[PDB]
């Protein structure tokens, strides 16, 4: 029938997204009180793709902030370090240094080339991040929809030397205190629009059988130690049957987790990655300060536990 036209069809779709993100942006409040430095390459490469933005506080109260990590959304195949500027605008205000990355967008690489990408921009941050504000002794990796499967994965392949070698990637040298995902997409092969949900696989995949065995977060979190999650998102949520699979796995698999979960009554509104796409709601700063909250109970266990209070 035809490869091109499926392709032609997606990208339609995400540039009608794009619109909407435009015009969103466009209207919406700006966090205040937030200093941004924008376009770091993380590698030898110009691809405009693999550069990341650090966002801080404008006034800091210490030297070094504990460390927000953000992975994007948008299907695999849209978005760039832009797209969530203000959200992380918005939790670096709150006295974190934030950092968030652009990584290749599908068709042109396929999953191991976005893991790669990411895994950069994280080796990089161990590199550079410390002489510019970050304690990367308390490190909270975050991720929506397609970001929050990408954060899911990033988080077993850190712990895990063979996933390490299968997505040829290396350990960093710091590591996750939470993993908050934000109705994540982590179970992409239950997603079956039946040939588009194929298109998507196919892509991630690039044909590759050690990929297809290894795309979704049930599929990596065997037999690893890992740290707590946080699942963050509500009823109204479009892929909220992505988050009642994903509880099956944690527990299934001996995850500790927390949920912040909007039911139903809570309106709708509470729609697909509200918490990202509106941080002035009400509901979106409640929600993403119970996240920050729990980063930083777990940051203070973590410092009594090394005798460093
Ligand atoms: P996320 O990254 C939300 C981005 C808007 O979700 C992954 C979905 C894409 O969302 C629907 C497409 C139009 C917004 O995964 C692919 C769905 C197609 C079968």
């Not at 942006?25 to 650090?54: C, G, I």
Request: glycine share 6%; with cysteine; aromatic share 12%.
């Amino acid at each position: 029938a035809d490869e091109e036209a499926m392709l032609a069809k997606v990208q339609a779709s995400w540039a009608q997204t794009a619109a909407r993100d435009k015009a969103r942006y466009a209207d919406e409040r700006v966090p205040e009180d937030v200093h941004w430095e924008t376009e770091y390459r993380y590698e030898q490469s110009a691809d405009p793709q693999q550069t990341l933005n650090l966002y801080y506080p404008a006034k800091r109260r210490n030297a070094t902030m504990p460390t927000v990590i953000d992975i994007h959304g948008g299907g695999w195949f849209y978005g760039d370090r832009n797209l969530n500027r203000n959200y992380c605008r918005y939790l670096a205000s709150q006295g974190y240094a934030v950092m968030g990355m652009g990584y290749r967008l599908l068709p042109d690489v396929d999953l191991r080339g976005q893991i790669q990408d990411i895994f950069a921009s994280l080796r990089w941050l161990s590199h550079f991040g410390p002489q510019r504000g970050f304690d990367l002794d308390h490190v909270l990796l975050t991720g929506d929809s397609a970001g929050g499967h990408l954060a899911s994965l990033v988080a077993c392949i850190q712990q895990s030397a063979e996933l390490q070698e299968l997505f040829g990637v290396s350990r960093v040298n710091f590591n996750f205190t939470l993993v908050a995902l934000v109705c994540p997409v982590a179970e992409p092969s239950k997603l079956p629009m039946s040939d588009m949900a194929a298109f998507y696989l196919d892509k991630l995949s690039g044909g590759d059988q050690a990929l297809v065995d290894h795309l979704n977060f049930s599929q990596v979190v065997k037999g690893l130690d890992l740290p707590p999650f946080m699942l963050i998102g509500g009823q109204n949520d479009s892929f909220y049957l992505q988050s009642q699979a994903l509880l099956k796995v944690f527990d299934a698999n001996h995850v500790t987790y927390t949920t912040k979960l909007w039911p139903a009554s809570a309106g709708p509104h509470l729609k697909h990655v509200f918490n990202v796409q509106h941080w002035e709601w009400p509901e979106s700063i409640e929600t993403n300060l119970e996240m920050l909250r729990t980063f930083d109970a777990l940051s203070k266990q973590q410092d009594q536990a090394e005798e460093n209070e």
